[PDB]
Amino acid sequence: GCVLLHTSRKYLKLKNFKEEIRAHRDLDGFLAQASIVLNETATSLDNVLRTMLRRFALDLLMAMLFTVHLLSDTIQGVTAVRYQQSWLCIICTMKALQKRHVCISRLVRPQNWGENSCEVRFVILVLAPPKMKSTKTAMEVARTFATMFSDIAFRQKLLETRTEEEFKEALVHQRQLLTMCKDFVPFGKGIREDIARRFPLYPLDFTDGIIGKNKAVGKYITTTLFLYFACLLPTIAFGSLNDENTDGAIDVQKTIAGQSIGGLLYALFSGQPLVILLTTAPLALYIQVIRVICDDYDLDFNSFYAWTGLWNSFFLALYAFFNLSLVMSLFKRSTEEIIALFISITFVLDAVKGTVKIFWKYYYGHGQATAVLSLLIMLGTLWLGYTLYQFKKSPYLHPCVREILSDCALPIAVLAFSLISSHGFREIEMSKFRYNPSESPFAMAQIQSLSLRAVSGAMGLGFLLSMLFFIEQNLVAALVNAPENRLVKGTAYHWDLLLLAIINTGLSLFGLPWIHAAYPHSPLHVRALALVEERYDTIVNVKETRLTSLGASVLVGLSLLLLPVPLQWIPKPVLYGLFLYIALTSLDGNQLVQRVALLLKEQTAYPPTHYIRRVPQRKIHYFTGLQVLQLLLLCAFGMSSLPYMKMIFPLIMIAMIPIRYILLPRIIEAKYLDVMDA
Amino acid sequence: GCVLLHTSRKYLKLKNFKEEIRAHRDLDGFLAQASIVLNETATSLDNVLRTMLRRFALDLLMAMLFTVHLLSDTIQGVTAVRYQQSWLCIICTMKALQKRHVCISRLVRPQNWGENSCEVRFVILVLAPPKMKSTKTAMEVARTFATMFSDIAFRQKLLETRTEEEFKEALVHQRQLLTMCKDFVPFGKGIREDIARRFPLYPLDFTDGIIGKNKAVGKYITTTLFLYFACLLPTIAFGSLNDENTDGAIDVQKTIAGQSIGGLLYALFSGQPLVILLTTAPLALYIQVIRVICDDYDLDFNSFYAWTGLWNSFFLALYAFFNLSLVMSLFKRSTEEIIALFISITFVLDAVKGTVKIFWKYYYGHGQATAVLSLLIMLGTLWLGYTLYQFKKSPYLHPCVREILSDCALPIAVLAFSLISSHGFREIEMSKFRYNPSESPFAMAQIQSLSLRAVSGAMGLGFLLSMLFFIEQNLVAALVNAPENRLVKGTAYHWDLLLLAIINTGLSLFGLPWIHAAYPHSPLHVRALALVEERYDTIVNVKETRLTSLGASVLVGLSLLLLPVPLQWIPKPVLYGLFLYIALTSLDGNQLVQRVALLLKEQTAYPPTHYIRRVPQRKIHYFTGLQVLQLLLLCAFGMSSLPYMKMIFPLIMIAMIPIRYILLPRIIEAKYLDVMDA
């Protein structure tokens, strides 16, 4: 009965006692239940293995060990390639075991058990159940002992030991050996250097995936379509929100026009073009507050709105000119993810609040079919978009066709349910955003009309706006420029901030809504243009190009000609489903979200991530809990009914840095915190 | 720089040229592009490998080969344990390759390359890309050549060859060598033997998981709860369907009472108690036809209904007494799955037809909020139930808590959305099944009242009913008794058929609806009580017990006391979601469904199933297409508007056997068809 024997040899990295705590935990567990065989007189591998098994407690266990050259799993040391015949590590997996059993047996005399086992003196048997954590599997536990025995000096010390207690002391002693401003002075250098880093690479932005090989034409078209829908609809909602707050001073037409002009300019004359500019709800809050201030006094809305925008741009220009973007590097992964998660929650709350608003107005008559259909459309749009989003991992279809279909998840879900609501349910009227003809012919707002005692108030709002703009712009840019994304071209933090002020001051003078780096869209824009290979998921490269951003801006601008059509065929629930879709898809890769899901996870399902290996689980869960506590602080201030607390929200984000670097070290060791950021 | 080398040795089964076609395909592909090196004068492994690589076309390729003892992957022959040093098979994986390259090099003289490679004469290098089908991976292709070279006689013949053409002929010649009634005579034995097989095991049915170790108390309670909801609701719909067809002759009270009494009796005095009895839509069609016949003539509905039930039981008694259940073994996996899929489609169509009925009555006013909410509730119930159903595979939660929560998918989904529709949407009226007080006091139907010329017509219906009962009872029992399910106790086909007639004749005399083996519930009952371990999914054992069936029947009977409560708090859309849930969950494991999904699958994602290995893909897809054609035949006859074609549906199922055993062999080879059944 001839059979085929498949032998596979792979190099395993030496266990890092300095960094990995599992080695120390496994050594302590072994010391607690030591099974050490001293002066084993058996001259054969079979007898030694049977003796070690008897120390553990049989032919049933002995048989499963084999399939030295007949052993199923073994680990041996190699010297840079000479094998280490001095010691041998035998590994086996048994389904009938509940714990991990490690036995170390020392032979009286060297034994010639094979080509690479001619001088065996130490035999290490590691038995573990198949169902165990990836950090404490049979291979991992053996690597802890293999690394210690890989030292020739340590093996010599073991041979000198005479008693079991001294043998343990050598193991403990070996473990100990293994275990053991100037910037801002040049004000202009930040702006100058960023231009110098980006200007030579400008032509490559328009020909990165168009000219030459690896033509990613389908990716660019899909990403532009994804950006077009993901940007036009929120601006429509924000434009309507401004319309009902400013009583027609700022409408859908101006909001979309500002987004198109600002996006087009940013896509052309800014480094790192993957950042997407969009108006946000906090910006709408400032516009609402400005209207309230202008209502209380005898002040023109456009004049006051322009002046605070001028001060906002002026302070942002100073921030770029003083190279203040460097201090934003203190926002490590610990703080960025919390702020990242908070913004995703806001989009979820906006959809929930909008659904309640529809139910309150229609279902309770402050009719019922509209509210019920609104819930169905919102849930259906989220389901269809998310199902298509996850379709990329499916084995179904041609890889190219599947990638195109999956990357078109948002455009297809919006269009499909827009037809369902508008055409399949014509008899049921649906809530839609208001549309009105042109009212303000893009005036200059008459900045000189406003007098003293009011520009100073605008300066205060402008300074507060600058704090919001400075933090948000750098946070999203840092997320785009995260080390996980390759982006070999470079970063243009200082130049982008200066251009953002230049874009904003133009919008403020014409009364257009302000726009800055929007958190959900930009990484999704990077994620859409990125190439991911299963291993877990790793981004090989990102197609850095201005075509997607520029193309989306043009399409949004062209939508102004046919503006009523989106405002009629696309109801609010479709937008609410879009908000749910982008919020959920933006959490794919969030460090805090994964650890939150980890809390609720069976131990055996814990992935072998870097932070789990280096940081104790107890400390990780404490860090996760503290981050959730910080998240609740953001929710209390950022999503409150009082407008003032929401306006001072950037101060809360600033206050997170002292908590991270002063308060958190007092609770959790600073070394563990640094690993989480890394 | 000391490193750790992990070597793993595993026995690989010799490639079966007789059964597996991939071996022949790989050998033909190698012959088409042969890379044979004859009389290699190199005395070192490195030079031979470099020469073979040059024949393929380098140090980059050479480096990836290693990490003989330094080779990453190798296959060697073992004699029952002596290694075969004559030949060696080297395996490597390269991401830069597009095809599979195999090279065979013969050495002039034996070389001593190691302990197990002291007489190397043949070197086999197999290079394949990582992304390939599981049947044609690097290991699989090497196994084809390893099996051929495992024969010492074949290696001697290769040494005798002088030219490359003769070397190919030896490879071809080696491939050829590797490639190359009485029953029914005892009428009563069927009934007697089944009782003898089940009577000694009767006490074990009530103490299989209650007394002793492995107490599966949570499984029994959950399964009883699952069966209670999965049975009570369809009987409610069928009872209402009978009420609107028979104009009050048969109502919800009688249908539930018949289900409870029939289920309780079957759970007690029947072998293989995992079979669940329930009324079906085709049975309701016969009741509707009986009412129409009784309306056309001057015949009592109860008298005619009882007589056809008497003949149905009489013919079923003869079928059990003549051991006719044996011929049902001809319904192999080829025909059972098609019938299995068809019944699942009927439950899907019933939910769809019911949804259209609600929309037609309410949305179009033949109001709108009811129809829209009905769609939302139906889709929501399916989503929540299916999400909880798939929660069992999740790493989330405690394994015990997760298993209990996931196995309660149907009860939780029904109860949760019943509260949502009845209590969360009180203002929106929902379609509900009719409830009326008791009208018929369980009479005996006065069988003797009916005269001649009408009992003969009942005999015709009874014979047609017997055909439906005989086929359906055996098909579901065969699915329960499938080889995948262990069920070490045995089978009681003949006894179950006789008892089914005894149960049915009692129901017919009292005017209760007939019940037989229901396809969706019974395997799900087996699946709920089964233990599944990931490998793919394999059922270790099934907890065979009568408690779940008996407990569910009692709960259904007790529901008659509080009958209005389910008929009010549970609307039709919740039931429609239940129909969608059971239909979809019943396809988990369907052979036809998996092959249908296979059609739409990328080649690299093809699982290494037995039928793929033995049967060509082209023939598999032809077999899948023919089965779909047979499915369309069932759909045309079984789900048509004409009642007569639906009544003769059992004839269509009978006609499938001649197609399988006479028509299918004419198109696809009989050997391939037998593999599909196996």
mmCIF file of C-alpha atoms in Angstrom, chain A residues 468-671:
data_model
loop_
_atom_site.group_PDB
_atom_site.id
_atom_site.type_symbol
_atom_site.label_atom_id
_atom_site.label_comp_id
_atom_site.label_asym_id
_atom_site.label_seq_id
_atom_site.Cartn_x
_atom_site.Cartn_y
_atom_site.Cartn_z
ATOM 1 C CA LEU A 468 -13.746 73.987 13.213
ATOM 2 C CA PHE A 469 -12.252 74.254 9.717
ATOM 3 C CA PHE A 470 -8.655 73.743 10.880
ATOM 4 C CA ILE A 471 -9.416 70.598 12.892
ATOM 5 C CA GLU A 472 -11.793 69.002 10.378
ATOM 6 C CA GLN A 473 -9.598 69.663 7.333
ATOM 7 C CA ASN A 474 -6.514 68.118 8.945
ATOM 8 C CA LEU A 475 -8.389 65.160 10.457
ATOM 9 C CA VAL A 476 -9.881 64.055 7.134
ATOM 10 C CA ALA A 477 -6.599 64.713 5.317
ATOM 11 C CA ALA A 478 -4.757 62.649 7.933
ATOM 12 C CA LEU A 479 -7.292 59.843 7.475
ATOM 13 C CA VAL A 480 -6.738 60.014 3.712
ATOM 14 C CA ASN A 481 -2.963 60.145 4.271
ATOM 15 C CA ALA A 482 -3.021 57.257 6.762
ATOM 16 C CA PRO A 483 -0.063 54.837 6.515
ATOM 17 C CA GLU A 484 -2.421 52.027 5.459
ATOM 18 C CA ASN A 485 -3.092 53.934 2.234
ATOM 19 C CA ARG A 486 0.138 54.041 0.229
ATOM 20 C CA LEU A 487 -0.166 57.477 -1.431
ATOM 21 C CA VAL A 488 3.475 57.613 -2.509
ATOM 22 C CA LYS A 489 3.033 61.101 -3.987
ATOM 23 C CA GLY A 490 3.092 62.950 -0.651
ATOM 24 C CA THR A 491 1.004 65.272 1.496
ATOM 25 C CA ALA A 492 0.006 68.922 1.082
ATOM 26 C CA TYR A 493 -1.509 69.807 4.464
ATOM 27 C CA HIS A 494 -0.362 73.440 4.498
ATOM 28 C CA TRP A 495 -1.258 74.189 0.869
ATOM 29 C CA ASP A 496 -4.722 72.629 1.177
ATOM 30 C CA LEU A 497 -5.531 74.782 4.212
ATOM 31 C CA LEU A 498 -4.527 77.973 2.386
ATOM 32 C CA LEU A 499 -6.573 77.052 -0.692
ATOM 33 C CA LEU A 500 -9.545 76.137 1.509
ATOM 34 C CA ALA A 501 -9.506 79.691 2.871
ATOM 35 C CA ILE A 502 -9.278 81.041 -0.690
ATOM 36 C CA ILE A 503 -12.240 78.888 -1.724
ATOM 37 C CA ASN A 504 -14.232 79.791 1.398
ATOM 38 C CA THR A 505 -13.760 83.562 1.084
ATOM 39 C CA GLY A 506 -15.115 83.413 -2.465
ATOM 40 C CA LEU A 507 -18.167 81.476 -1.286
ATOM 41 C CA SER A 508 -18.742 83.869 1.624
ATOM 42 C CA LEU A 509 -18.589 86.959 -0.601
ATOM 43 C CA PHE A 510 -21.274 85.493 -2.892
ATOM 44 C CA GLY A 511 -23.306 84.058 -0.013
ATOM 45 C CA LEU A 512 -22.584 80.442 -0.897
ATOM 46 C CA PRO A 513 -22.455 77.812 1.869
ATOM 47 C CA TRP A 514 -19.042 77.000 3.282
ATOM 48 C CA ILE A 515 -17.450 73.645 2.446
ATOM 49 C CA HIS A 516 -14.555 71.755 4.034
ATOM 50 C CA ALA A 517 -13.183 68.211 4.100
ATOM 51 C CA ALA A 518 -16.110 65.839 4.622
ATOM 52 C CA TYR A 519 -15.225 62.792 6.722
ATOM 53 C CA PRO A 520 -17.407 60.036 5.174
ATOM 54 C CA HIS A 521 -16.815 60.668 1.474
ATOM 55 C CA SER A 522 -13.046 61.143 1.268
ATOM 56 C CA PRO A 523 -11.768 57.786 2.647
ATOM 57 C CA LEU A 524 -14.560 56.108 0.674
ATOM 58 C CA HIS A 525 -13.197 57.965 -2.352
ATOM 59 C CA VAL A 526 -9.757 56.607 -1.437
ATOM 60 C CA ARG A 527 -11.247 53.175 -0.702
ATOM 61 C CA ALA A 528 -13.036 53.123 -4.063
ATOM 62 C CA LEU A 529 -9.788 53.945 -5.888
ATOM 63 C CA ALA A 530 -7.751 51.493 -3.787
ATOM 64 C CA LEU A 531 -6.793 47.933 -4.723
ATOM 65 C CA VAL A 532 -7.433 45.329 -2.014
ATOM 66 C CA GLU A 533 -6.043 41.779 -1.930
ATOM 67 C CA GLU A 534 -7.127 39.059 0.484
ATOM 68 C CA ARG A 535 -4.443 37.669 2.790
ATOM 69 C CA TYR A 536 -6.402 40.257 6.185
ATOM 70 C CA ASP A 537 -7.426 42.866 3.615
ATOM 71 C CA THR A 538 -4.400 44.835 2.399
ATOM 72 C CA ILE A 539 -4.382 47.874 0.104
ATOM 73 C CA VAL A 540 -1.718 47.350 -2.559
ATOM 74 C CA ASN A 541 -1.996 50.841 -4.061
ATOM 75 C CA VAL A 542 -4.380 53.760 -4.559
ATOM 76 C CA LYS A 543 -5.017 55.301 -7.988
ATOM 77 C CA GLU A 544 -4.280 58.934 -7.154
ATOM 78 C CA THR A 545 -6.032 61.091 -9.746
ATOM 79 C CA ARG A 546 -7.911 64.375 -10.033
ATOM 80 C CA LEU A 547 -10.321 63.054 -12.683
ATOM 81 C CA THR A 548 -12.762 61.521 -10.187
ATOM 82 C CA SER A 549 -12.964 64.663 -8.043
ATOM 83 C CA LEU A 550 -13.057 67.006 -11.047
ATOM 84 C CA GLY A 551 -15.551 64.840 -12.927
ATOM 85 C CA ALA A 552 -17.903 64.620 -9.950
ATOM 86 C CA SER A 553 -17.798 68.401 -9.474
ATOM 87 C CA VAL A 554 -18.705 69.002 -13.128
ATOM 88 C CA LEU A 555 -21.609 66.544 -12.926
ATOM 89 C CA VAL A 556 -22.924 68.261 -9.785
ATOM 90 C CA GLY A 557 -22.683 71.621 -11.543
ATOM 91 C CA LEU A 558 -24.485 70.298 -14.617
ATOM 92 C CA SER A 559 -27.246 68.977 -12.338
ATOM 93 C CA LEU A 560 -28.213 72.598 -11.636
ATOM 94 C CA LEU A 561 -29.631 72.885 -15.163
ATOM 95 C CA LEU A 562 -31.990 69.944 -14.509
ATOM 96 C CA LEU A 563 -32.323 70.653 -10.776
ATOM 97 C CA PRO A 564 -36.077 69.875 -10.365
ATOM 98 C CA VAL A 565 -35.635 66.285 -11.597
ATOM 99 C CA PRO A 566 -33.505 65.076 -8.630
ATOM 100 C CA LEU A 567 -35.690 67.159 -6.300
ATOM 101 C CA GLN A 568 -38.797 65.300 -7.547
ATOM 102 C CA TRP A 569 -37.778 61.731 -8.431
ATOM 103 C CA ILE A 570 -35.507 61.368 -5.376
ATOM 104 C CA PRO A 571 -37.458 61.584 -2.093
ATOM 105 C CA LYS A 572 -36.046 62.103 1.380
ATOM 106 C CA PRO A 573 -36.132 58.390 2.428
ATOM 107 C CA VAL A 574 -33.752 57.519 -0.425
ATOM 108 C CA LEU A 575 -31.359 60.122 0.978
ATOM 109 C CA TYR A 576 -31.837 58.701 4.481
ATOM 110 C CA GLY A 577 -30.880 55.272 3.167
ATOM 111 C CA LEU A 578 -27.823 56.894 1.600
ATOM 112 C CA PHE A 579 -26.857 58.358 4.984
ATOM 113 C CA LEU A 580 -27.187 54.923 6.597
ATOM 114 C CA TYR A 581 -25.176 53.322 3.784
ATOM 115 C CA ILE A 582 -22.251 55.756 3.938
ATOM 116 C CA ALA A 583 -22.131 55.711 7.748
ATOM 117 C CA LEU A 584 -21.988 51.910 7.937
ATOM 118 C CA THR A 585 -19.549 51.488 5.039
ATOM 119 C CA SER A 586 -17.246 54.122 6.571
ATOM 120 C CA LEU A 587 -16.782 51.930 9.668
ATOM 121 C CA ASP A 588 -15.176 49.105 7.649
ATOM 122 C CA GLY A 589 -11.676 49.429 9.090
ATOM 123 C CA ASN A 590 -12.429 51.566 12.163
ATOM 124 C CA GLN A 591 -10.124 50.565 15.011
ATOM 125 C CA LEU A 592 -12.656 51.427 17.727
ATOM 126 C CA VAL A 593 -15.533 49.620 15.991
ATOM 127 C CA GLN A 594 -13.504 46.420 15.602
ATOM 128 C CA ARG A 595 -12.529 46.459 19.284
ATOM 129 C CA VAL A 596 -16.150 47.143 20.253
ATOM 130 C CA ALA A 597 -17.173 44.093 18.217
ATOM 131 C CA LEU A 598 -14.261 42.243 19.840
ATOM 132 C CA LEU A 599 -15.734 42.770 23.313
ATOM 133 C CA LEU A 600 -18.649 40.772 22.164
ATOM 134 C CA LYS A 601 -16.600 37.960 20.602
ATOM 135 C CA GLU A 602 -15.749 34.429 21.707
ATOM 136 C CA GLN A 603 -12.133 34.096 22.760
ATOM 137 C CA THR A 604 -11.370 31.530 20.087
ATOM 138 C CA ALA A 605 -12.478 33.999 17.380
ATOM 139 C CA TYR A 606 -9.969 36.704 18.370
ATOM 140 C CA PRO A 607 -7.877 37.636 15.303
ATOM 141 C CA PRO A 608 -4.059 37.708 15.636
ATOM 142 C CA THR A 609 -3.904 41.493 15.320
ATOM 143 C CA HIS A 610 -0.808 43.419 16.376
ATOM 144 C CA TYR A 611 -2.456 45.178 19.328
ATOM 145 C CA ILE A 612 -3.766 41.902 20.774
ATOM 146 C CA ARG A 613 -0.287 40.350 20.620
ATOM 147 C CA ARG A 614 1.461 43.320 22.259
ATOM 148 C CA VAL A 615 -1.209 44.721 24.613
ATOM 149 C CA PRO A 616 -3.049 42.645 27.251
ATOM 150 C CA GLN A 617 -6.708 41.969 26.538
ATOM 151 C CA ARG A 618 -7.702 43.498 29.830
ATOM 152 C CA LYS A 619 -5.895 46.723 28.917
ATOM 153 C CA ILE A 620 -7.358 46.669 25.391
ATOM 154 C CA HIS A 621 -10.911 46.436 26.733
ATOM 155 C CA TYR A 622 -10.169 49.217 29.226
ATOM 156 C CA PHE A 623 -8.875 51.340 26.339
ATOM 157 C CA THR A 624 -11.995 50.507 24.318
ATOM 158 C CA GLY A 625 -14.218 51.464 27.253
ATOM 159 C CA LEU A 626 -12.403 54.764 27.766
ATOM 160 C CA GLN A 627 -12.750 55.576 24.060
ATOM 161 C CA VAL A 628 -16.495 54.899 24.266
ATOM 162 C CA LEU A 629 -16.605 57.250 27.260
ATOM 163 C CA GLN A 630 -14.869 59.888 25.134
ATOM 164 C CA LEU A 631 -17.361 59.137 22.353
ATOM 165 C CA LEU A 632 -20.260 59.763 24.745
ATOM 166 C CA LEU A 633 -18.683 63.123 25.599
ATOM 167 C CA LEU A 634 -18.682 64.007 21.894
ATOM 168 C CA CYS A 635 -22.296 62.842 21.558
ATOM 169 C CA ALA A 636 -23.412 64.941 24.538
ATOM 170 C CA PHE A 637 -21.819 68.122 23.163
ATOM 171 C CA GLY A 638 -22.019 67.488 19.417
ATOM 172 C CA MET A 639 -25.602 66.197 19.204
ATOM 173 C CA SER A 640 -27.407 68.237 21.855
ATOM 174 C CA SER A 641 -30.501 70.400 21.537
ATOM 175 C CA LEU A 642 -28.631 73.497 22.735
ATOM 176 C CA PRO A 643 -26.926 75.213 19.761
ATOM 177 C CA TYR A 644 -24.173 76.723 21.927
ATOM 178 C CA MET A 645 -22.780 73.360 23.052
ATOM 179 C CA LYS A 646 -22.738 72.130 19.451
ATOM 180 C CA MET A 647 -20.895 75.298 18.401
ATOM 181 C CA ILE A 648 -18.165 74.761 21.022
ATOM 182 C CA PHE A 649 -17.761 71.181 19.787
ATOM 183 C CA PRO A 650 -14.275 71.879 18.300
ATOM 184 C CA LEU A 651 -13.141 72.769 21.832
ATOM 185 C CA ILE A 652 -14.225 69.286 22.937
ATOM 186 C CA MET A 653 -12.180 67.763 20.108
ATOM 187 C CA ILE A 654 -9.224 69.895 21.221
ATOM 188 C CA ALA A 655 -9.781 68.730 24.809
ATOM 189 C CA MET A 656 -9.354 65.118 23.649
ATOM 190 C CA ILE A 657 -5.590 65.616 23.148
ATOM 191 C CA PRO A 658 -4.896 66.381 26.851
ATOM 192 C CA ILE A 659 -7.024 63.363 27.793
ATOM 193 C CA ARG A 660 -5.042 61.109 25.446
ATOM 194 C CA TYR A 661 -1.589 62.291 26.538
ATOM 195 C CA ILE A 662 -2.164 63.168 30.232
ATOM 196 C CA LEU A 663 -5.229 61.333 31.572
ATOM 197 C CA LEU A 664 -5.029 58.048 29.649
ATOM 198 C CA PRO A 665 -1.393 57.322 30.701
ATOM 199 C CA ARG A 666 -2.495 57.604 34.344
ATOM 200 C CA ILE A 667 -4.900 54.669 33.841
ATOM 201 C CA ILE A 668 -3.222 52.533 31.151
ATOM 202 C CA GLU A 669 0.532 52.207 30.673
ATOM 203 C CA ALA A 670 1.909 54.575 28.040
ATOM 204 C CA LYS A 671 3.662 51.713 26.232
#
